[PDB]
Amino acid sequence: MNANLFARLFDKLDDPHKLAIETAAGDKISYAELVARAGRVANVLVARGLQVGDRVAAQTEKSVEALVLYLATVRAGGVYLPLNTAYTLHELDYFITDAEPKIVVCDPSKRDGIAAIAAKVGATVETLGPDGRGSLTDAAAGASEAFATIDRGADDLAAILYTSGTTGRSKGAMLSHDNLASNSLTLVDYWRFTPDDVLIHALPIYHTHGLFVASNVTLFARGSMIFLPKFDPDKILDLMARATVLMGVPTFYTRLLQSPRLTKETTGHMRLFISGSAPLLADTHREWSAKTGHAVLERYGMTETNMNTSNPYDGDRVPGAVGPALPGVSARVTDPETGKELPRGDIGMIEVKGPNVFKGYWRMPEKTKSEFRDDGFFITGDLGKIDERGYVHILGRGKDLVITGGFNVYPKEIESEIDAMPGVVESAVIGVPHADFGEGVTAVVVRDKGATIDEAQVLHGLDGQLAKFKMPKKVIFVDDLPRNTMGAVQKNVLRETYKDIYK
Numbered sequence: 055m056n057a058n059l060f061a062r063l064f065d066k067l068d069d070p071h072k073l074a075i076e077t078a079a080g081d082k083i084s085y086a087e088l089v090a091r092a093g094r095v096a097n098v099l100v101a102r103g104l105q106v107g108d109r110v111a112a113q114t115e116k117s118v119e120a121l122v123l124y125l126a127t128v129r130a131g132g133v134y135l136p137l138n139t140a141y142t143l144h145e146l147d148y149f150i151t152d153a154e155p156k157i158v159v160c161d162p163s164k165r166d167g168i169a170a171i172a173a174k175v176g177a178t179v180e181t182l183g184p185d186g187r188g189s190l191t192d193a194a195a196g197a198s199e200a201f202a203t204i205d206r207g208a209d210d211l212a213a214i215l216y217t218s219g220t221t222g223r224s225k226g227a228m229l230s231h232d233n234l235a236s237n238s239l240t241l242v243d244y245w246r247f248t249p250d251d252v253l254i255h256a257l258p259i260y261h262t263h264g265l266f267v268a269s270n271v272t273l274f275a276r277g278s279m280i281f282l283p284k285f286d287p288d289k290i291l292d293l294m295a296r297a298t299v300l301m302g303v304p305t306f307y308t309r310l311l312q313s314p315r316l317t318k319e320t321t322g323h324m325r326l327f328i329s330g331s332a333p334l335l336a337d338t339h340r341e342w343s344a345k346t347g348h349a350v351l352e353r354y355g356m357t358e359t360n361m362n363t364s365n366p367y368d369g370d371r372v373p374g375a376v377g378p379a380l381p382g383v384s385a386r387v388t389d390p391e392t393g394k395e396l397p398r399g400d401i402g403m404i405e406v407k408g409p410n411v412f413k414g415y416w417r418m419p420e421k422t423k424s425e426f427r428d429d430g431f432f433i434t435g436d437l438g439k440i441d442e443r444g445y446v447h448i449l450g451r452g453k454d455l456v457i458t459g460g461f462n463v464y465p466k467e468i469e470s471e472i473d474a475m476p477g478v479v480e481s482a483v484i485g486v487p488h489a490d491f492g493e494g495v496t497a498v499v500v501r502d503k504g505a506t507i508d509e510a511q512v513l514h515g516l517d518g519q520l521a522k523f524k525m526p527k528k529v530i531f532v533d534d535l536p537r538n539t540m541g542a543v544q545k546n547v548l549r550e551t552y553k554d555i556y557k
């Protein structure tokens with residue numbers, strides 16, 4: 055009855071020699087082998103000063119060794135803290151100072167620089183490279199495989215993941231053993247994962263999607279995964295003939311749609327395509343079904359909440375919607391201010407509650423308090439509505455709402471109109487200060503190479519479909535939209551870039 059995620063996963067292992075992970079080089083690792091690797095690394099953590107509750111901060115390229123470090127940290131009663139591989143030394147200083155890890159694991163090439171930061175909190179530094187080699191690996195080579203998995207309670211911490219930083223400086227979400235186990239166990243059943251599943255895993259593992267959703271679901275299900283270092287369209291297509299599931303972000307799908315190899319035949323062996331982490335556009339959903347005959351299953355989650363909602367595996371998968379609340383999870387829509395729940399169909403603030411919901415922000419009890427309602431619901435900061443069937447629809451982030459001339463203007467329906475115009479790839483509608491209207495609705499648009507469509511053409515096209523107060527005051531064409539490492543459009547960046555256009 056140990057609640058320790060590692061114990062939930064592996065204490066009882068009925069089929070130990072079954073495949074768990076195939077590496078990018080084609081090496082194969084069984085469940086028993088994975089467990090033994092984690093035992094060695096857990097012993098290394100203790101030998102390097104880990105005490106129960108200590109954080110282990112890890113910035114490494116993706117590898118099975120890096121995944122093992124996650125498992126071992128949890129197993130040893132530590133708190134795993136993955137960090138975006140792109141963070142610079144200076145950025146890392148903030149996270150290391152905030153979290154005060156006892157151990158920091160980094161790429162061999164950064165050891166000297168990171169050691170300086172680590173010394174500020176007295177952390178021990180080990181290394182792990184893209185090839186799975188380094189001081190961590192040397193230490194594990196002589197360590198014992200046997201390790202008594204540490205007793206942990208449901209609410210004890212297993213991890214701290216920093217948010218993606220879309221709306222400001224990343225905050226450290228404190229995730230418990232039960233947060234992670236309850237969510238992944240629910241998903242195994244809800245998505246019907248079985249030991250026969252083979253998951254193509256091409257996502258980063260410093261983010262909740264690639265780290266927890268991909269790994270924990272597979273591992274609980276006793277299925278396996280195939281690692282790829284990053285999104286590679288041709289390698290992903292190659293693997294579909296011998297895999298059953300792909301978890302991706304919308305950019306995976308729009309990029310795969312550009313391959314002439316993406317056909318019914320090429321995807322015919324696959325069971326399920328899942329999309330998450332950013333909005334899957336309804337047009338993208340329809341394009342995928344038109345080209346491949348598969349209905350993409352989209353789900354919605356956050357760093358702070360793990361997965362909240364999902365389109366059903368055995369029900370209607372609705373373009374533009376993220377599905378009803380998962381089993382065990384409650385979702386509602388409230389008046390953003392007052393907090394009163396709204397009638398089904400009304401747009402407002404999405405709030406969630408459940409065993410998936412985190413314990414708060416690391417050493418930010420005040421900001422934690424402001425993000426929870428009195429009755430324990432968490433304010434997502436996402437605006438949307440819940441339809442008559444209980445499907446949640448996300449309209450945008452609260453900060454993406456544009457208030458202009460006294461009106462609430464929701465950008466997505468404008469973007470949908472612009473996207474539908476011939477010559478348009480995609481568009482982002484934002485608001486920036488305007489002296490006459492409060493904010494000026496501004497359309498930032500990516501067009502096809504050689505497309506003729508221009509500003510006047512775009513505004514005229516909208517004129518006959520859109521209320522006057524919703525009309526963009528100008529259209530700005532760009533080579534591409536700014537996106538973070540997980541493929542999300544950064545409207546924060548756009549608002550900053552164009553803040554002065556109406557000055």
Ligand SMILES: Nc1ncnc2c1ncn2[C@@H]1O[C@H](COP(=O)(O)OP(=O)(O)OP(=O)(O)O)[C@@H](O)[C@H]1O
Binds near residue numbers: 225358
């Ligand atoms: N399927 C989806 N459809 C629409 N939006 C989504 C979906 N999945 C995730 N999102 C958006 O991503 C957010 C979760 O992102 P994440 O936890 O990676 O950090 P972030 O919110 O982007 O960064 P920060 O919290 O630092 O501002 C959600 O709150 C939601 O706005």
Ligand SMILES: [Mg+2]
Binds near residue numbers: 356
């Ligand atoms: Mg957020």
